Amino acid sequence: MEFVNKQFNYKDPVNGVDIAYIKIPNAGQMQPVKAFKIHNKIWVIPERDTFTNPEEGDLNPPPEAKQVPVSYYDSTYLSTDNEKDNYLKGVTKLFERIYSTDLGRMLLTSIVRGIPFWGGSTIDTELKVIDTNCINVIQPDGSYRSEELNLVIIGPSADIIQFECKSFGHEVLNLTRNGYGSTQYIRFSPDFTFGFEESLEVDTNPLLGAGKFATDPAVTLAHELIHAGHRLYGIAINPNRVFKVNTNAYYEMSGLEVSFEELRTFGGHDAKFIDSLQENEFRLYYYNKFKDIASTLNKAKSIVGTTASLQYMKNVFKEKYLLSEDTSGKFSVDKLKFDKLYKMLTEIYTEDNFVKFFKVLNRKTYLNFDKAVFKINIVPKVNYTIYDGFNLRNTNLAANFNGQNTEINNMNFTKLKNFTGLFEFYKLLCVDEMALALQCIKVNNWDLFFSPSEDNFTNDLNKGEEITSDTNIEAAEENISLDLIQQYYLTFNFDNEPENISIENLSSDIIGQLELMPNIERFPNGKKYELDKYTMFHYLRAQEFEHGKSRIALTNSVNEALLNPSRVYTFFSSDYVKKVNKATEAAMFLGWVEQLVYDFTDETSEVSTTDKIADITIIIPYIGPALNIGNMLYKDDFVGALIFSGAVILLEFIPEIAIPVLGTFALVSYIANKVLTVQTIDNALSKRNEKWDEVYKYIVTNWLAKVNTQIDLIRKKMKEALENQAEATKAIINYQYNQYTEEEKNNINFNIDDLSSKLNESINKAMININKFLNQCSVSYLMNSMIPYGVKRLEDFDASLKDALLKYIYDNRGTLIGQVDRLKDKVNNTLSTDIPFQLSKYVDNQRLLST
């Protein structure tokens, strides 16, 4: 009742104020749809989206499959009044959940504030509303009334789980990128969610649930509202600017296509893939675009198309863009204030930050792709609440995110058919049949490796700089934390919103067309690779078995588990395979099962400590035979190979890191001035600290995108490998149990859910170790294989500045008579020592900092 003020029903009578048949900007002529105004500037249309796009009227599956991990198609969805009512209540509920958090409260306020700019006038001294930023509200009497708005929530198009921000474009202006902003139409459904898998939280939660977890749809909505946020303030990054990936190697993906805008919206490490140069380019770009709005507001003389005054309208956009105004009435953009507003919309309003506030399990990267799709019902309070989500307090579902777990909370999630086939998009990995014949496995596109292009990483480190006494000292960029979010919250003006002012009627049908959007080419599909050796993907495939009818499964230690469907590979000792494959009689069964649970824990809990490697203090030897690391199929060979060559042995590809010759400093001399001569020397020295900081940050960015992503995938694959082992073990134990007759009843009394629960527990404990080990390798690599490159490049820069400052001091020794000896020592001391590399300065991730 805080954000949404009325408790709406779909069958409520049309009134023409908050419940009315409306008409939106259209290519042709549309028929009115019943819509609901949940808040000021925010409307909801409980219909399938068939009107915004003239080419999207059909709700059937497209001729071509479409390149997404998970998709769902159902034309019958959102046709019944019951469905539309439940949609309206669902969307309303999620708005309340977003608002109930400190961060969501801020976001929703910023969205209402972000009224699209009145730049539809051809005469540059008049303020006129852009017609596509409005809707026509039809009254009970028959007449219509045009109204300004910021946001519209519509149901999905053909693909039900494809959520996105849409907006209508101008013929000449780029409204979402010029600072103006345009009305946002979000395609969303609260009746479906994504199924994902996570294993990173097991450190804090050892009793974590088994299978797939469900994405809280509030997070999803908040994600789309952030996209709307950027777009309303016209600060959205060009959809052209995509993160280009290498697609030629066998281990690489066939293609991904992720926009910078997407990585920015997520936050975490994902936002840090974008380097300092490109990020500064964007910040300075929208700084000048805001200044253009300030210029147009100073040239504005009269207002047209509304009863409201020019003085009021200028004030609205003053509040929106946080402009400073003189007593003379002139507007300007404050540098420090814009940065506060930009950082907020860019770095504070992120998906990862919302997770903090909701206290829910969620994907930690964008590259943690969805695996399934579930039908949900969040409207009943017994199922979902504004405060707790799925994870209801004082219930079984409170601890370890149990409410989000598909298997424990199975009555809340019904698994649906993924319309993307398991091998719709794939590479084909082949090997010599043991080339007269080949043995080939299909690997799904999203099980492959990222591998970003070098084109995505640009810098101006080579560019020289002229040091003066007036040289600006960059304030240390404070990293995102809850303390900072708290500070923005306290400075926030929550009361007072922009008003719903009466504007003059537009034409009966608003003529509008959606934003152009770049035409993205389809990836090459089904590429074949003929390989000399078995790969990681083969070893992972060998551990898989047909879930269905076929039973008799026998575990073994050779990768010819690929040949026989009854044979499944394992990396556990030969004693484990002998024990599990042993025929057992009813009398011996329970003691045989108890002993297998024991061995399963013992094989997986194996930890070998070391001090020889450095940076890496622990090792997990069975990762070698589990994934074929370095083509050395021995537990002894993995431990030995890791000590010898370090973390690089885990990597699928060696990242290229290009640091150029660092731009030297040039000094500006001032004759007969002792004060400003000392200032320039001091300015050059503290500007060197920024240079060390700049390089360090650049290396952290490359490591975060090229290396840490690889390790991220290996841990996910180890989680899969362990799950495969438990499944195979359960299948064999359950097969033996079903081979008995009537002695199953009382004599045994065996619970498979208990066996599954105990094995899941042992997997979690194994992952605790594995996560700890693989984090060390990622950082180990950063410290010994990536940072040194920058350091010796930086030490050569210190050499150039050393002689530059010593010659400078010498050349001005008549001006600095009494201080020459002192200044000579400071230059010699500070430029001889390296600046210590602190990981906590560039990486906020506190579980990466745990090393």
Give the residue ranges of the annotated binding site for Zn(2+): 223, 227, 262
Provide CB contacts within 8 A for 390, sequence distance 6+.
Answer: 214, 216, 360, 383, 384, 397, 403, 404, 409, 412
CA distance 449 to 466: 43
Closest CA to 759 of 632, 612, 602: 602
The answer to whether the beta carbons of residues 438 and 430 sit under 8 Å apart is yes
Q: Which run of H or of E encompasses 793?
A: helix 787-811
The answer to whether the beta carbons of residues 849 and 843 sit under 8 Å apart is yes
Q: Residues before each break in the chain (C–N > 2.5 Å)?
A: 434
CA distance 536 to 530: 15
CA distance 53 to 483: 43
Of the residues 224, 351, 603, 694, which is catalytic?
224
* 224 given a catalytic annotation: yes
The total of other beta-carbon atoms located within 10 Å of residue 7's CB is 9
The answer to whether the beta carbons of residues 18 and 6 sit under 8 Å apart is yes
363 three-class SS: coil
Closest CA to 242 of 274, 289, 277: 274
CA dihedral (636, 637, 639, 644) in degrees, to 10, reads 140
The answer to whether the beta carbons of residues 373 and 161 sit under 8 Å apart is yes
Task: Please identify which residue in the block is written with the tokens 């370090």.
Answer: 646
Binding residues: 223, 227, 262
47 three-class SS: strand
The total of other beta-carbon atoms located within 10 Å of residue 338's CB is 18
As a 3-state breakdown, the chain gives helix, strand, coil percent values, each rounded to 5, of 40, 15, 45
The total of other beta-carbon atoms located within 10 Å of residue 670's CB is 15
- Angle in degrees, 0-180, between the axes of helices 351-358 and 102-113, rounded to the nearest 10: 140
Exposure string for 429-443, b = 16+ CB within 10 A, e = fewer: bbbeeeeeeeeebeb
Task: Please identify which residue in the block is written with the tokens 């960015």.
Answer: 701
Task: Please identify which residue in the block is written with the tokens 């930690």.
Answer: 364
Token readout for 317 is 């956009």
CA distance 387 to 236: 31
Q: Among all residues, which ones are annotated catalytic? A: 224
